[PDB]
Paper text:
AChE regulates cholinergic transmission at the synaptic levels by hydrolyzing the neurotransmitter acetylcholine (ACh). Monoamine oxidases A and B (MAO A and B) are enzymes cleaving the Cα–N bond of several arylalkylamines (including xenobiotics and neurotransmitters such as dopamine) upon a FAD-dependent oxidative deamination reaction.
Among previously reported micromolar or sub-micromolar coumarin-bearing dual inhibitors, compound 1 returned a tight-binding inhibition of MAO B (Ki = 4.5 μM) and a +5.5 °C increase in the enzyme Tm value. Indeed, a linear increase of IC50 values was observed indicating that 1 is a competitive tight-binding inhibitor of MAO B. An analogous experiment carried out with (±)-2 revealed that IC50 values are not significantly influenced by enzyme concentration, suggesting that this compound is a purely competitive inhibitor (data not shown). Therefore, all ligands had a stabilizing effect by increasing the enzyme Tm but 1 determined a remarkable +5.5 °C shift, which was in agreement with its tight-binding inhibition mechanism. In the structure of MAO B in complex with 1, the hydroxymethyl substituent at C4 lies between the Tyr398-Tyr435 pair forming the “aromatic sandwich” found in other flavin-dependent amine oxidases. The bis-N-benzylamine moiety is wedged into a pocket of the entrance cavity adopting a hook conformation that was never observed in other MAO B structures. As a result, the shape of the cavity, whose plasticity has been so far limited to the open/closed switch of Ile199 leading to the bipartite architecture of the MAO B active site, is in this case conserved in proximity of the flavin but significantly transformed nearby the protein surface. In MAO B, the coumarin moiety and the linker of 1 are forced to stay longitudinal by the rigid enzyme cavity and the terminal aromatic ring is accommodated in a niche of the entrance cavity rather than protruding out of the protein surface as observed with (+)-2. This unusual binding is allowed by conformational changes of the residues in the rear of the cavity (His115, Trp119, Phe103).
Residue numbers in the entry:
A (entry chain B): 3 to 496
B (entry chain A): 3 to 501
Amino acid sequence: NKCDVVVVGGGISGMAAAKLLHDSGLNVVVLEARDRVGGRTYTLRNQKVKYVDLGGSYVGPTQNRILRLAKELGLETYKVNEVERLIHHVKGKSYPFRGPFPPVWNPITYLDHNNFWRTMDDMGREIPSDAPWKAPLAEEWDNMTMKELLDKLCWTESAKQLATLFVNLCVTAETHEVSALWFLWYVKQCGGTTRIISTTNGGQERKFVGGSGQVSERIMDLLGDRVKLERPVIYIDQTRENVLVETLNHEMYEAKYVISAIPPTLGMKIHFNPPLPMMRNQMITRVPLGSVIKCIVYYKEPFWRKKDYCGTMIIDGEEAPVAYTLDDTKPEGNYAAIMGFILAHKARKLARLTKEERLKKLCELYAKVLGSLEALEPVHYEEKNWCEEQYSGGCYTTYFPPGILTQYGRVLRQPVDRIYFAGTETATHWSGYMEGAVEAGERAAREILHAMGKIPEDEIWQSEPESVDVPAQPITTTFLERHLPSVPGLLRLI
Amino acid sequence: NKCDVVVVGGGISGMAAAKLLHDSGLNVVVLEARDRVGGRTYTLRNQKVKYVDLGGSYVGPTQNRILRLAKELGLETYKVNEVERLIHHVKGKSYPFRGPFPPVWNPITYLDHNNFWRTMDDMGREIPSDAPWKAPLAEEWDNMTMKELLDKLCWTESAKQLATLFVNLCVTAETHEVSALWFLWYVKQCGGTTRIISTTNGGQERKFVGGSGQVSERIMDLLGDRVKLERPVIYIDQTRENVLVETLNHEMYEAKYVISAIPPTLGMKIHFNPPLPMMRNQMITRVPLGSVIKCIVYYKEPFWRKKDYCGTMIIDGEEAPVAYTLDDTKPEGNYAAIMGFILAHKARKLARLTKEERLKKLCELYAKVLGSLEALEPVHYEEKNWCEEQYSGGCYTTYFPPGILTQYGRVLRQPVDRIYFAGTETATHWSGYMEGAVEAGERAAREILHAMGKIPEDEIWQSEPESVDVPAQPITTTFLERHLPSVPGLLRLIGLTTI
Ligand SMILES: *Cc1cc2c(cc1C)nc1c(=O)[nH]c(=O)nc-1n2C[C@H](O)[C@H](O)[C@H](O)COP(=O)(O)OP(=O)(O)OC[C@H]1O[C@@H](n2cnc3c(N)ncnc32)[C@H](O)[C@@H]1O
Ligand SMILES: *Cc1cc2c(cc1C)nc1c(=O)[nH]c(=O)nc-1n2C[C@H](O)[C@H](O)[C@H](O)COP(=O)(O)OP(=O)(O)OC[C@H]1O[C@@H](n2cnc3c(N)ncnc32)[C@H](O)[C@@H]1O
Ligand SMILES: CN(Cc1ccccc1)Cc1ccc(COc2ccc3c(CO)cc(=O)oc3c2)cc1
Ligand SMILES: CN(Cc1ccccc1)Cc1ccc(COc2ccc3c(CO)cc(=O)oc3c2)cc1
């Protein structure tokens, strides 16, 4: 019935918001559509896997809010295995390498590849994190897909395939589907190409012991009966003195304020009175989520480490179901496993198959990439197709098609009367990640503390001290990386 | 509570479906979200306008189903005024012309222009109406925006600017927003470039006496109390023997089948049990509608006719609020009016102005374009911003961004258990129009008649006799239009001849 704030959605963002309001002395209710909390994080437990992250999993340096929240809740991290060599599989062959991205040996291709990622970072430096529509070339860049940008920029097929794989892996969408402006903002607001792609010293450095689902679960433990499971919100009425929020199971919640902590497009599942203003009414029809099946094959031992492979595979080409993998073995060396993503159009394609059919295809691919018959002998398999989730819409995050971010992007976090907007999509650092979810939940919470007169405006956005446990090292470039010419640049000099 | 078929949506599609099902003996209920039927058609009546269409309005040759439905309901059509000259306004100057598109005198530009719409129609013939994703180059065309297609095809800026305006007018979206495959399909399934753009012998030839809103209102008259206004559907449960459909005002309806006759993305407003299959689940987050404000400025007299202007203006330029107008004078010659569209990014930009400020900007534009100070003397104004409609999502219709139609297109009208899909977006001919609404509504109803064993499979898709009142002149080309080279084709002829 009555409270101070109703939070819609019990993902990390909603939970982080609810925890902050609760800790400040307000009465909060969290309305969650599903029979669980965690949303796009989900940790499955059984005896075969012990625990496995089937959704969001990795955290790394510069993600200081999720690390502080998780540490307070009593969680600890361990490092993803990256002691041995990475593998780039291209044109049916495996090339082992060390470092964040595969070395290029052909000198023309080297120039072209080097220029491409240098250029993504250069372009990013002109895009404000909190307002990408204010980039000097915002409209130009927003009216191009990433496919067009890559066709203009890449002179070699081989750099273009690498760059395409990069886009597919970062945002689980095809290059032709996404705005260039949006994608370039996305990379930049994670701290750039190196930081976004890297395990060591990057976004995939670490996992939580026991799974990331414990973040949402432990906050639920704190809030007790204030969290209502299987309460999908259908109706929010703001015509009266207090805000009225109705659920599908026929309950009514009354509050001074609401935090919407759901993906923007899932706003469509709610009937509003009065209707939303025009820009938000259209925006929420224009912002899909990507497509991904997360797949984990278990083995008796981490047999790849014997061949001096870490388990990371970057896999080129149309025929491979999986483009990217990481070692998902536990810290102790047991429950050996490879984690792989079936991305974008391959997710639509292979979802038709049975679970056993997908396992066979993955095992045969890994046998080829890792060069071991051991890969043909899985002891267990887990997978989740996030495309089929009614209350997520896909994974990892919301992508913006061409034209949308400049026309509608301004309204993402704009309050609608007494509704404030959270969700990772509204963050300005690591938006799309669990880190963004924390930033956005806590920021929306503090917007409401400010509307209530409890805090000054300058405390709505709060900086975060660096994690002592997971410090950031500088991102560096070499002299040659910075000043080698592009392919057209070399041509002009001839 | 109990019936044979619940129809969700009381637009033309829903009402056509419900009418067919009722006439064949079944017990139907229509659940409509709004306090009125008609959806994206809406006829306003007051003493200043008598009546005016603020949404869907025009019908034309080849739209035989809406013409038949309208005629059986006791409606009549009249011709939109195209007696005098059209105007093309570009770079601040007005160029009167006759015929469907502004003729191009600069020969190079002529070749480029000619080639552009010829290539639109050529590519269109590659694309099956009922399965655009089966075109031989479906993938390549779908992975491209219309902006990229026009940048490759137009060797002159003037052709490119005309092509851009064509896309904005047809689908109320920017060239960079829409899939090339989708747009080429959309045009082809309307009968091609000429048919879609034309007043005489095209989509905009006629209007209903009294407004298009009467189609929905008259079917509601025939169905009586079976139509339920202010029943937004929130929940559809298919787990039991009978389908359960729940509304926001707390009513439960129980049926054998459901027709969903709402724009695909407004399917998001419904919670499904069991959950939708993956492909539909994602598809309905990927298919927005366009952006338009429809504006009608009333004048003492249709003063433009006296200058030998019919009232049609094709207006190119960033400063121009309105890109296209038609004469909206009553057939009796009174309530003189100009109907205009504010399209795509201009809808967004100008929505933040007041009604009075928008009227002012339109008048100043019309005055310049028509060369007439009388345009600054309006007697009345009406407008409707469709972008602000919770239960439409925009107008005229749904567009597909790059990559969506090939990946998700095949599930648009794929039934989900005992839910069948209508709405104009699921039609194969004049999808996006009132015609497509009628086609899709009647087809979905007949899918259900087949499921119930009342008709054979070959009667689901039914052809439509040609209107005797609105006969279709065929679309013809001249020899020169068919065989004149493109710009790069001419350049090839030049390089070859000089060797
Ligand atoms: C799915 C996924 C995500 C993911 C990733 C891999 C996959 C396969 N890998 C990641 C990673 O390694 N590291 C990382 O930091 N993030 C990763 N991601 C993304 C990450 O999981 C997400 O950014 C994050 O979990 C998003 O959190 P947020 O709190 O913003 O959103 P959410 O989890 O979707 O929660 C929304 C909740 O709202 C409920 N809901 C939806 N509709 C309603 C209604 N109408 N009423 C009530 N509740 C509603 C949802 O059920 C959900 O719980
Ligand atoms: C908006 C517009 C449309 C239009 C046009 C100009 C404008 C500004 N010009 C046209 C023209 O000149 N000639 C023509 O043939 N078409 C033109 N268009 C398009 C035309 O209006 C539409 O194609 C057509 O009206 C679509 O009919 P359909 O029946 O397919 O779709 P609808 O009208 O949107 O009806 C949907 C109904 O469903 C209700 N609804 C929505 N959600 C719910 C829920 N959850 N529960 C119950 N009911 C729901 C809507 O309220 C609506 O009545
Ligand atoms: C193909 N690419 C080329 C390249 C790109 C940029 C700069 C230099 C070279 C190398 C590369 C290496 C590793 C990656 C991995 O990137 C990600 C990005 C986001 C995630 C996420 C998102 O949360 C989850 C995850 O499990 O793994 C990820 C992995 C991408 C691209
Ligand atoms: C700019 N263009 C150039 C061109 C386009 C194609 C072939 C040759 C030249 C000419 C032109 C002229 C008129 C039009 C008008 O097109 C439409 C399309 C759909 C509608 C619709 C859709 O319902 C409603 C309406 O009131 O007006 C429309 C008007 C478009 C294009």
